[PDB]
């Protein structure tokens, strides 16, 4: 009937009544979307209607124009732009006019304004928008609601909108935001909305920050805001200071001394946890930026050039005053622990850690004294703090300075493992684990190993929060022991090592831990399996007897879960069966490694048989899960060509994994598996290639596929080409053009989330061409010549390389791949390639850069290629 009546029914607590209402609206939007929106906006815009109907209308509008789904979003945006400009004009008028006329707390108009703006701004279709929003805020006669709802609108636009679209109007946006944050502003609500919008907006105030006049204006408003009496504004302002430090570190030098240091140190000492957390994050974030600057400085030095950005070492300068604040905060442990909850105490530990790795040696002498003062304090809060701080500084300082300190700490640390406080024992295990990780020499000592091992063994039976760190400590100890034994001096793998004596007890104790009923708490079970896994890998040969037993137990468990999965009762059951299967399979990826290949075979056939059964039952019931595919890969690695026996049966399950493109993670694993099948089955994969190749190309048509699938599919094209050689001619044309296009992709660096998808995908392209050029040519030939079909493409591939050489943005993985390709071309097409290569000086420069190593063999490939071009002379 009436739109309003329907709208009010959408909030009914009755399922059917809520269904009728929703279907009415659905088909209305299908029968005449333009007229539906206009009517909806009229409801929203009229204060005469009930709050329920206005809010409901706002929701119908917003949902017609956006969605979390990027693809559906862009689609809704285009459906909007195609509507009569006059109808859209009317909707824009009403939505805009609703701002400030809502009694509702959070405005429903803000999100509609943003939804339409995100569509219309990139094509200048709503020139009226910005200047209207700016007027709403700056107008001294505007009500609190008008200003608040508007600032939220601004915020939603900066957040949802394409990043490239909003710089031409940053000047106006900032005028409104800054005006809304001024301290004279009577309403904290307005200040809060304004400050939240600033945060969303910083991404495009680049041109504004480059102007001292404006930069100075912005910093004063944010700093003053950190003094607002409304805690919500204080926190939001600090959040802005943190983001400003990440994007405009270059400009900060004039504000740190005179403002920021004091503001953020005061925030850290605040009794309001929300405030302390922002002060701490500010100084953890400075550590991150400065560690990144040090890498930039270091790389620029090896290039005989000064770095583009320089560090002012603020962490180093602040360190004196940071540490005493942070150690005290470590004293505020939350007695009821929640390994999923964040508080000042935990943030302080991370911050201390980052300071250790940022300022390295400097830090020791500021922390030690607190540690020695409190290591034996009767108050557990201080005893634990002391042990925590000790573990936080084990990475960063020169190991030569830490060793003596760690060795003299062992006796006390071993005792603390038996401390009456569970909180203390939790930290002792972590600190012990981090000693083993970072400074194993202290633990692999003829003095302390025996008693340390006794503590760790007993600790596996302790409470979850303690046993979990103990597990990690054990695996770390195992890795070190293994390495120590076989740096060298014996040959292929080590005959014995310091853990051999108790290897049996450890595995059985770990196998027990895996099975504890409270295993779900504190990530125990996973930690136990990770540890078992890591210790089986890192074991000496005189440990085989224990290794085999453990493998019989793992298969036993795996065989069990697998058949449990052809008889599922519930989606809870469904979920846990896969979680155990996941851990067991991952564990399998190390045991199969590490037996006799003869035995690995008997195990492989048995497991694959069980998985195929699980596949036959499990899925089409939500299946295929991904770790099962990775499980198959390791299984294909062992059976190699002997896997051909299961192809006819596995084939469909390969497909379903390839076809499933919505779960790019499953698809991805399916793609990689195809590559593994190529190297294993080789030529024998031919009779399967059509099906696969067809599914691959299909997927490439595209684009709600994930970014990340394409490069892998391209890489696999190369493998397929290597595996079937001449038989690839069938696909040659379509693939080359696909490569052609993907080569021309050229995202512009102001972004980095693209700079290293560009390289991820470029490398992929190079591996593709390499597999094709080598696939069509030859080993023990009769004559050669399929490759000649690609001959006409040489000019372009070289251009693609030349363009890669100019871009300072080289991943070593790419330089190498590009070098290997050049060498391939020389060996394939010969002395015509020379003229083309000497016509691009940048290619010469690319090879030299590869003749210096990073990595290893980028240098070999670059060395090889340089040689091939030389011999062509």
């Amino acid at each position: 009937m009436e739109l309003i009546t329907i709208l009010e029914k959408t909030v009914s607590p009755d399922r059917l009544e809520l269904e009728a209402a929703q279907k009415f609206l659905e088909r209305a939007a299908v029968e005449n979307l333009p007229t539906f929106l206009v009517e909806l906006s009229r409801v929203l815009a009229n204060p005469g209607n009930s709050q329920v109907a206005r809010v409901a209308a706002g929701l119908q509008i917003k949902n017609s124009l956006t969605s979390k789904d990027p693809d559906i979003k862009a689609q809704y945006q285009q459906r909007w732009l195609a509507i009569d400009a006059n109808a859209r004009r009317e909707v824009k008028n009403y939505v805009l006019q609703t701002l400030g006329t809502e009694t509702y707390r959070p405005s429903s108009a803000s999100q509609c304004v943003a939804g339409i703006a995100c569509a219309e701004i990139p094509v200048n279709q709503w020139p009226e928008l910005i200047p209207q929003l700016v007027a709403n805020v700056t107008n001294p006669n505007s009500t609190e609601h008008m200003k608040e709802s508007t600032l939220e609108a601004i915020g939603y636009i900066c957040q949802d909108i394409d990043p490239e679209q909003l710089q031409d109007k940053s000047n106006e946006i900032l005028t409104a935001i800054i005006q809304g944050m001024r301290k004279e502003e009577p309403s904290n609500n307005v200040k809060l909305a304004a400050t939240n919008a600033l945060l969303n907006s910083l991404e495009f105030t680049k041109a504004n920050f480059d102007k001292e006049s404006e930069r100075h204006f912005i910093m004063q408003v944010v700093c003053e805001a950190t003094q607002c009496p409304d805690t919500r504004v204080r926190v939001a302002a600090l959040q802005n200071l943190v983001k400003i430090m990440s994007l405009y570190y270059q400009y900060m030098e004039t504000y740190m001394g005179p403002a920021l240091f004091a503001i953020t140190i005061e925030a850290m000492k605040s009794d309001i946890d929300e405030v302390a957390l922002q002060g701490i994050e500010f100084w953890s974030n400075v550590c991150d930026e400065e560690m990144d600057l040090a890498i930039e400085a270091s790389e620029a030095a090896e290039q005989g050039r000064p770095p583009e950005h320089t560090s002012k070492f603020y962490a180093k300068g602040a360190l004196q005053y940071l540490v005493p604040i942070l150690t005290q905060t470590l004293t505020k442990q939350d007695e009821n622990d929640d390994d999923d909850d964040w508080n000042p105490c935990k943030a302080a530990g991370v911050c201390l850690m980052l300071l250790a790795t940022c300022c390295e040696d400097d830090i020791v002498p500021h922390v030690l004294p607190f540690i020695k003062e409190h290591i034996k304090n009767p108050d557990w809060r201080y005893r634990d703090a002391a042990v925590m701080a000790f573990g936080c500084i084990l990475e960063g300082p020169e190991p030569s300075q830490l060793k003596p300190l760690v060795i003299q700490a062992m006796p006390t640390l071993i005792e603390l493992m038996k401390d009456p406080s569970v909180v203390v024992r939790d930290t002792a295990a972590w600190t012990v684990g981090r000693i083993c990780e970072l400074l194993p020499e202290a633990a692999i000592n003829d003095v302390y190993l025996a008693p340390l091992l006794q503590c760790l063994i007993e600790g596996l039976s302790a409470e979850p929060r303690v046993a979990s760190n103990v597990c990690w400590a054990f695996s770390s100890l195992a890795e070190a022991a293994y390495e120590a034994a076989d740096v060298a001096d014996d040959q292929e793998e080590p005959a014995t090592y310091c853990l051999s004596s108790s290897f049996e007890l450890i595995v059985q104790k770990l196998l027990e831990t895996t099975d504890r009923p409270d295993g779900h708490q504190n990530n125990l079970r996973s930690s136990a399996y990770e540890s078992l896994m890591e210790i089986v890998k890192n074991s000496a040969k005189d440990c085989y007897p224990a290794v085999q037993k453990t493998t019989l137990v793992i298969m036993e468990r795996l065989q069990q879960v697998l058949q449990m999965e052809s008889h599922i009762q519930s989606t809870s059951d469904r979920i846990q069966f896969n979680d155990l299967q996941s851990l067991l399979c991952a564990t399998l990826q190390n045991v199969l490694r590490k037996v006799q290949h003869q035995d690995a075979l008997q195990i492989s056939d048995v497991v694959m048989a069980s998985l195929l059964r699980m596949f036959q039952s499990t899925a089409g019931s939500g299946g295929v899960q991904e770790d099962a595919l990775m499980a198959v890969s390791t299984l294909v690695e062992v059976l190699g060509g002997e896997f051909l026996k299961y192809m006819e049966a596995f084939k469909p399950f390969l497909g379903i994994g390839l076809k499933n493109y919505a779960e790019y993670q499953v698809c991805l694993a399916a793609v990689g598996l195809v590559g593994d099948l190529c190297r294993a089955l080789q030529s024998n994969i031919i009779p399967f290639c059509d099906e696969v190749m067809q599914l691959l190309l299909e997927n490439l048509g595209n684009e709600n596929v994930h970014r990340s699938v394409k490069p892998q599919i391209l890489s696999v094209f190369g493998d397929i080409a290597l595996a079937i050689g001449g038989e690839f001619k069938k696909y040659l044309e379509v693939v080359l053009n696909t490569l052609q296009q993907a080569s021309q992709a050229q995202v512009d660096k102001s972004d980095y989330d693209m700079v290293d998808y560009l390289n991820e995908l470029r490398e992929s392209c190079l591996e593709a061409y390499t597999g094709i050029v080598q696939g069509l040519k030859g080993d023990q030939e009769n004559v050669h010549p399929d490759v000649m079909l690609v001959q006409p493409r040489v000019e372009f591939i070289l251009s693609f390389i030349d363009h890669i050489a100019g871009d300072e943005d080289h991943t070593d993985g790419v330089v190498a791949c590009a070098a290997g390709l050049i060498g391939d071309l020389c060996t394939a097409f010969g002395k015509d390639v020379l003229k083309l290569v000497e016509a691009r000086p940048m290619i010469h420069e690319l090879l030299t850069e590869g003749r210096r190593s990073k990595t290893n063999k980028a240098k070999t490939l670059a060395t090889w290629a340089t040689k091939e071009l030389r011999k062509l002379k």
Binding site: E281, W472, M630, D779, G823
Partner: protein, 39 residues
Amino acid sequence: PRLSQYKSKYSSLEQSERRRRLLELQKSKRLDYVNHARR
């Protein structure tokens, strides 16, 4: 917010470590498979 850094351990299993490792392995395999085919 950096909860994952609190008492940071290390796992060849969560989601993404075992991806990074599986991919790194398949790529090394690939490269060796290719190099025996160049020289």
